[PDB]
Design a protein around this ligand. Structure first.
Ligand code: 3PE
Ligand code: 3PE
Lengths: 96, 69, 172, 309, 93, 111, 96, 344, 71, 80
């Protein structure tokens, strides 16, 4: 149905050029947790109407790791700004 | 000590209205009857059925034993 | 209040993501998520499931977003700005915004447009498709979270949360 | 006529606290060996109606140092959710029969911290920039002290909905099995709503006569709400089907006494000097909360007294 | 169908009053601190593991109970052991 | 596929209200017991309720005489019994505990 | 790779939250519950390399149970069978 | 610190067990989710900002490498809804399956995912832990196997050795020289996998052992190439022959045992008449040795050991299970009559 | 009893959604009335679009959205 | 160690009371026989419909009459 087509374009807010770029680097990690709830709901559509009654734990246990993964990378950007004061992803010294 | 007693009888009376008002609406909207509550989907199914067979379109009226005799 | 009240929230939910998709000088990005996920909470509150969506207010919208909003003040201590007040922000805001109505424009507005872009008709009640009625047990969805058979999940997921604290008990 | 039930709850609750700043002072008056409002009333009762006129006469000058879209946005939500939280509340009949509503009160009260972070930040420097942060930082610590001991009585009452909560307390006054919880209920709720012992609470000093009155009117709206919320939970009243009037007589009059308690504790105690203020939560409150959380699980099991639902 | 027609009056009343407050009857013609960060991260950890603690009163009207008894107590253990290692270092908090 | 006609429809549906249907609700099925459990095997054991349409009328027919039976002999304490439970709210079975004996004094006695 | 510890030592890690019709804690089935019980019965001893060429049928109605795809295609064209003749009569049926 | 340094190290292998021991798409979601949460503090220990400016580049790569996987998982929930680890029943999902999963096994795309991480880490002790992330997703691919589009998997493998054969001609950092050629063996064991997924792990086992010996021989003092000049006449001349015993084997010459999988890789690949593709890979593997020659020319020819500072003191490292490692890494090529019988 | 009072309704309900479907258009590119979308001739439970057609004015909202968003 | 309970209960009298509620809570569900009455009730709550079965020869027990003494006895609770 159309309720599956939207939301499916809403998954394509994980646009990668707007996922690690540009600076004000919190706006990058913004859409990462914003890529969550495009999967919490999209799963919870099909689990709910097709009465499964057992995979209700699956979107709940999804959000447990969804914040927990999001808890880690927020800490490191403080450690970026601990020695700098601003994020500014155009910071680059360690090259490949 | 006396003057505080008219202070109590203003704001405390101002809470007497909506409990009186709401219990004189749903009682009034169903004609002296309380509103049928529905918390489980089996409970709603009665109201979804009985409204279609009450007399025309209502859930707050009954038929009784004298309907089908 | 019409029949199309469920679908019309979903299209609004699409545009909440586009509000922070470019660079909304990231303090309004929090105000792009609260408007979105609340409407996203509205979409879950159909279809039978009441309990499982309302927690996303508490655990994420009250939980993650505050700590998200607790940053961008302890860092990014420069001068912010209102978005759309620049030319670096509005350079792509309209581009996918046109397609969001253009996708709706011909999925079903013509008679047959065409074969693979007209498969899903809009409406009308098949979006629910939940008859007939059920039981007095629960929603259900009400007997949904159980400390029966799933227990191997809880011992793993709880122990993963414990070592998450220790990694943050260190460096920071 | 569903609409006239709405306006006969929003409007008659504004006068319930607009005539309380009067009562705030007179209860404060007759402790200090002094009288209430004397010249205007005569019994005081003509004082706040004139003072309500003044704050809309006096000119609301705006900060040139701030935005405008953010500055009036926080008083928008201030009357929004702090009045929305009244809605699924019975007396004895709620406006909405929500199937689950105890989660719904916490879901709305968790956005109360999301308003104070606006006004201090978008306005100005230092005081409004650092001083407004800490107040979120204390009020984030009082949901875990709030929600856990909240959950420990749903284990014995039975479910999430509030309509069954009246029937299960028809013989009890449930403070008697939870008088340890009664302290940590009332202390924690006192601390969240930003009152005299638990105060550090620039997020007011910039507001002129216009929008200061809102965030004085919304803050008061919270405090009778934590009174009326403790009222249905701890000190449950009797219910009569054939006489619904007798419910509401002995309903608000019990909440009105606990309303005086916020006025009464304010006239005794000093502050808590912020470093202690969170230190008395984690080190001191929280280990007892987990212990009594374990207590209300084993005992209904070791009674065969599980509440039915 | 009034939920959704229930709060729409409430929010149009707040945004009305500001126009008589801030508008037309006026017409005038950050340093970083580490100790104020780690409590927000610490809160969100105990904010998650009360949502897994959350489905308890529906988890009593159930089957064989000692599965649900001994496992629900285990989450409180992990919530408490997490305190003790963190209790070794809280900072000026 | 196939469906049976408009005939074998329009049979006497028990046009009563939900409260008076849940009024007795306890003496009803406790003594009929012949078509209902057979109708359950007709629905639970064998699916496709299109080979299973006949006995849905048989258990319906038994309820027709059933309310006709209680109407002819003892109905005055019955009509007051669903009167009190009509005063609504959750339909509890302890509010109308007092009037229960006046109904139930004759159900074991009259019929 | 798949060591399968749970096969020798006879406990299940989960193995229950796997298909649509396994446990159902109060015997409450799903919508396409009746086709799982058939489609598993088709290919059990089959080694899955001829299963895409032997059974091939009970997978189809099962897959179309989950979407009601051509049913939605058949029902939508009724709005083109009638409902282009709106002003050309054919009320069909009169109420009620 | 030293108590939990084992405990953090313990839970990494606890993650990849759950990846191997499950029949469920949500546990293997959790599996290398908690691994990606368990690798971060190993990068940190000395709290240097370069290590923080390397882990966060490592972080948000593998975050997407998690989060793209679940988008594949909900599709075969909407498509037949079964949760057994099997074929995916959608080529739109199997496309989303592999080329998300190939991030954690980093292919010829996702270029700087390997070197920019491994260079810049002070912890050259190990950093052999990036063999575990080479071990876990291979334990999914053995089960994804009989539903792949069959062209995507070989395209990433032909490109894999093509860039890895080119990367170390422009290098001195022996970490980056060892960061490269980790793309090399991860092209081969993907290129077998449509034809007999067994004996893929034979390439996997040999790669573990010949990388385990490499950094343990690098934990003497060396981190830079010209630092491998100043140990033959300074640290120990016995290490100079042993480092030549492995760099020539890992190039794949038949008298040593590094050639042994590539011996067997063709006996499987032909007999299914694909001829032009093994010839293009084996001729590319010629360039895999010109890393090692032009590196072994520096340490085994006494290229000017300057900077007079003599080590008259003994050595006490932790050469844990070290001397027993290059005994199956050189002379095992006669000693495998059937390695494809105990493993397969 | 009420189970027998529900399946009787949907046999009536599908009939007037079929008998008023057979009489729509007897087209040569038209449907054979009485066909099934599936091959397995068994009794699947019907769908909400099969109980109620494209009528959808009040009563269809009154059925699906009955328990949902209020009593 | 005997004064160790009397040099901390006069020193930090908060978490001492917590461990006593950590105690007396794990032990007692394995002690009193009021439990397993919790199990007998929580299983004997009828949610769904008890569907009857088909007779063929036997008849081990339970004929069609519901008010016959043919099944179990959970009616101790009403007498309890
Ligand atoms: C074995 C059987 C099962 C177990 C049964 C055992 C039952 C135990 C029941 C215990 C539950 C209540 C205790 C909860 C903890 C109370 C908080 C507390 O005690 O903190 C103490 C506080 C901190 O300071 P402190 O640690 O004492 O260090 C200084 C030493 N000179 O120091 C203080 O003393 C200050 C007090 C706190 C400050 C706030 C006071 C504001 C006034 C609030 C008035 C409350 C009125 C009553 C509540 C309203 C009723 C709803
Ligand atoms: C008699 C043994 C040689 C004399 C004692 C060994 C002293 C020594 O440590 O020399 C090691 C030497 C390595 O050479 P290098 O490091 O360049 O120069 C160091 C010279 N001190 O040379 C070595 O010994 C390296 C060891 C070679 C590989 C191990 C072989 C052991 C040989 C002893 C057993 C003899 C039987 C083994 C051969 C069997 C053939 C069938």
């Amino acid at each position: 149905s159309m309720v599956y087509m939207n939301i499916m374009m809403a998954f394509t807010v994980s646009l990668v050029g707007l996922l690690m770029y540009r600076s004000h680097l919190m706006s990058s990690l913004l859409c990462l947790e914003g890529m969550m709830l495009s999967l919490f709901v999209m799963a919870a559509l099909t689990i709910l109407n097709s009465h499964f009654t057992l995979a209700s734990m699956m979107p709940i246990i999804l959000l447990v790791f969804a914040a927990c993964e999001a808890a880690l990378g927020l800490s490191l950007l403080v450690m970026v700004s601990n020695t700098y004061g601003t994020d500014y992803v155009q910071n680059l010294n360690l090259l490949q | 000590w006396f003057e505080v007693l008219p202070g109590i009888a203003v704001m405390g009376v101002c809470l007497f209205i909506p409990g009186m008002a709401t219990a004189r609406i749903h009682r009034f909207s169903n004609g002296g009857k309380e509103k049928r509550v529905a918390h489980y989907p089996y409970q709603w199914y009665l109201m979804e059925r009985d409204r279609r067979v009450s007399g025309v379109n209502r859930s707050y009226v009954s038929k009784g034993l004298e309907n089908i005799d | 209040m019409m029949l199309y009240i469920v679908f019309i929230l979903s299209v609004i939910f699409v545009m909440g993501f586009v509000g922070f998709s470019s660079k909304p000088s990231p303090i309004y990005g929090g105000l792009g998520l609260i408007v979105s996920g609340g409407v996203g909470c509205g979409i879950v509150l159909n279809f039978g499931g009441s309990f499982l969506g309302l927690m996303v207010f508490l655990i994420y919208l009250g939980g993650m977003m505050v700590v998200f909003g607790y940053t961008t003040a302890m860092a990014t201590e420069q001068y912010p700005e209102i978005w759309l007040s620049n030319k670096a922000v509005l350079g792509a805001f309209v581009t996918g915004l046109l397609m969001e109505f253009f996708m709706v424009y011909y999925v079903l507005k013509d008679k047959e447009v065409e074969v693979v872009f007209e498969f899903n008709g809009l409406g009308d009640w098949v979006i629910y498709d939940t008859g007939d009625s059920g039981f007095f047990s629960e929603e259900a969805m009400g007997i949904a979270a159980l400390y029966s058979y799933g227990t191997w999940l809880v011992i793993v997921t709880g122990w993963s949360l414990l070592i998450g604290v220790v990694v943050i008990m260190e460096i920071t | 006529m569903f609409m006239i039930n709405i306006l006969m709850l929003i409007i008659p609750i504004l006068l319930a606290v607009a005539f309380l700043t009067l009562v705030e002072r007179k209860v404060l008056g007759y402790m200090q060996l002094r009288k209430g409002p004397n010249v205007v009333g005569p019994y005081g009762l003509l004082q706040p109606i004139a003072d309500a006129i003044k704050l809309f006469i006096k000119e609301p000058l705006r900060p040139a140092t701030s935005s405008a879209s953010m500055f009036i946005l926080a008083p928008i939500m201030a009357l929004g959710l702090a009045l929305t939280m009244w809605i699924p509340l019975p007396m004895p009949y709620p406006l909405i029969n929500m199937n689950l509503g105890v989660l719904f009160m916490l879901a709305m009260s968790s956005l109360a911290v999301y308003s104070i972070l606006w006004s201090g930040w978008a306005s100005n420097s230092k005081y409004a920039l650092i001083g407004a942060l800490r107040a979120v930082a204390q009020t984030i610590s009082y949901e875990v002290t709030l929600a856990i001991i909240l959950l420990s009585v749903l284990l014995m009452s039975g479910s999430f909905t509030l309509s069954t909560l009246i029937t299960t307390q028809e013989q009890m006054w449930l403070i008697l099995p939870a008088w340890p919880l009664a302290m940590m209920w009332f202390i924690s709720t006192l601390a969240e709503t930003n009152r005299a012992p638990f105060d550090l609470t620039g997020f007011n000093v910039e507001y002129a006569a216009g929008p200061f009155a809102l965030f004085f009117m919304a803050e008061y709206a919270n405090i009778i709400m934590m009174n009326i919320f403790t009222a249905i939970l701890f000190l449950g009243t009797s219910h009569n089907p054939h006489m619904p009037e007798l419910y509401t007589i002995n309903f608000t009059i019990k909440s009105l006494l606990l309303t005086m308690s916020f006025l009464w504790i304010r006239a005794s105690y000093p502050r808590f000097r912020y470093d202690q203020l969170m230190h008395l939560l984690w080190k001191n409150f929280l280990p007892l909360t987990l212990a009594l959380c374990m207590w209300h699980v084993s005992l209904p099991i070791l009674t065969s007294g599980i509440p039915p639902q | 169908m009034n939920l959704m027609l229930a709060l729409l009056t409430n929010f149009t009343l707040a945004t009305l009053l500001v126009i008589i407050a801030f508008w037309l009857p006026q017409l005038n013609v950050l340093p970083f601190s580490m100790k104020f960060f780690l409590v927000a991260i610490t809160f969100l950890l105990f904010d998650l593991e009360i949502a897994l603690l959350l489905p308890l009163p529906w988890a009593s009207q159930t089957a064989n109970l000692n599965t649900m008894l001994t496992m629900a107590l285990f989450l409180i253990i992990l919530l408490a052991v997490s305190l003790a290692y963190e209790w070794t270092q809280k900072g000026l908090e | 596929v196939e469906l049976p006609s408009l005939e074998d429809l329009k049979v006497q549906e028990v046009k009563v209200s939900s409260s008076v249907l849940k009024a007795a609700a306890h003496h009803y099925g406790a003594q009929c017991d012949k078509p209902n459990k057979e109708f359950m095997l007709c629905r639970w054991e064998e699916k496709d309720p299109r080979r299973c349409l006949e006995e849905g009328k048989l258990v319906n027919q038994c309820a027709l005489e059933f309310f006709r039976q209680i109407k002819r002999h003892c109905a005055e304490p019955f009509t007051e019994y669903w009167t009190c439970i009509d005063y609504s709210g959750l339909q509890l079975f302890r509010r109308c505990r007092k009037q229960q004996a006046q109904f139930d004094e004759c159900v074991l006695d009259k019929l | 790779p798949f060591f399968d510890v749970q096969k020798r030592l006879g406990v299940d890690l989960d193995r229950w939250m796997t298909i649509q019709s396994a446990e159902q804690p109060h015997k409450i089935p799903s919508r396409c519950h009746a086709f799982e019980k058939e489609w598993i019965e088709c290919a059990h001893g089959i080694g899955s390399i001829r299963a895409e060429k032997e059974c091939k049928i009970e997978f189809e109605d099962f897959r179309e149970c989950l979407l009601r795809q051509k049913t939605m295609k058949r029902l939508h064209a009724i709005r083109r069978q009638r409902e282009k003749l709106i002003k050309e009569g054919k009320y069909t049926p009169p109420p009620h | 610190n030293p108590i939990i340094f084992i405990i953090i190290l313990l839970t990494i292998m606890l993650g990849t067990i759950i990846v191997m021991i499950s029949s469920h798409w949500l546990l293997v979601w959790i599996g290398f989710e908690m691994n990606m949460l368990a690798i971060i503090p190993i990068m940190m220990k000395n709290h240097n900002p370069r290590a923080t400016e390397a882990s966060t580049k490592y972080f948000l790569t593998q975050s997407t490498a998690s989060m793209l996987l679940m988008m594949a998982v909900i599709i075969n929930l909407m498509f037949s809804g079964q949760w057994t680890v099997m074929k995916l029943f959608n080529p739109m999902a199997s496309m989303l399956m592999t080329m998300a999963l190939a991030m954690k096994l980093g292919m010829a795309p996702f270029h700087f995912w390997v070197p920019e991480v491994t260079q810049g880490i002070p912890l050259s002790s190990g950093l052999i832990l990036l063999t575990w992330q080479k071990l876990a997703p291979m334990s999914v691919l053995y089960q994804i196997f009989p539903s792949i589009n069959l062209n995507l998997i070989l395209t990433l493998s032909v490109l894999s050795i093509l860039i890895g054969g080119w990367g170390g001609l422009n290098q001195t950092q022996l970490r980056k020289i060892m960061a490269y050629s980790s793309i090399a063996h991860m092209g081969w064991m993907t290129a077998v996998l449509p034809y007999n997924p067994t004996m893929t792990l034979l390439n996997l086992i040999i790669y573990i052992i010949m990388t385990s010996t490499m950094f343990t021989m690098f934990m003497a003092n060396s981190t830079t190439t010209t630092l491998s000049l100043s140990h033959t006449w300074n640290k120990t001349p016995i290490m100079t022959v042993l480092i030549l015993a492995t760099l020539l084997s890992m190039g794949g010459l038949p008298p040593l045992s590094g050639f042994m999988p590539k011996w067997m890789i063709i006996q499987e690949m032909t007999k299914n008449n694909s001829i032009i593709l093994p010839t293009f890979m084996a001729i590319t593997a010629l360039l895999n040795l010109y890393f090692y020659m032009r590196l072994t020319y520096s340490t085994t020819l006494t290229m000017f050991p300057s900077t007079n500072n003599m080590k008259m003191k003994w050595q006490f490292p932790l050469m844990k299970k070290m001397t027993f490692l290059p005994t199956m890494v050189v002379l095992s090529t006669m000693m495998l009559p059937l390695t494809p019988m105990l493993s397969v | 009893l009420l189970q027998a009072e529900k399946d009787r309704r949907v046999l009536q309900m599908l009939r007037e959604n079929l008998e008023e479907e057979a009489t729509v258009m007897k087209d040569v590119p038209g449907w054979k009335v009485g066909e099934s979308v599936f091959h397995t001739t068994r009794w699947v439970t019907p769908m909400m679009g099969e109980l109620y057609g494209l009528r959808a004015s009040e009563e269809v909202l009154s059925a699906t959205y009955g328990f949902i968003w209020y009593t | 160690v005997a004064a160790f309970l009397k040099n901390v209960w006069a020193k930090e009298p908060v978490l001492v009371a917590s461990f006593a509620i950590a105690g007396l809570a794990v032990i007692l569900p394995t002690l009193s026989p009021y439990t397993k009455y919790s199990l007998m009730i929580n299983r004997a709550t009828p949610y769904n419909y008890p569907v009857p079965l088909r007779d063929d020869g036997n008849m081990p027990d339970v004929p069609s009459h519901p008010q016959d003494p043919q099944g179990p006895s959970l009616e101790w609770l009403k007498r309890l």
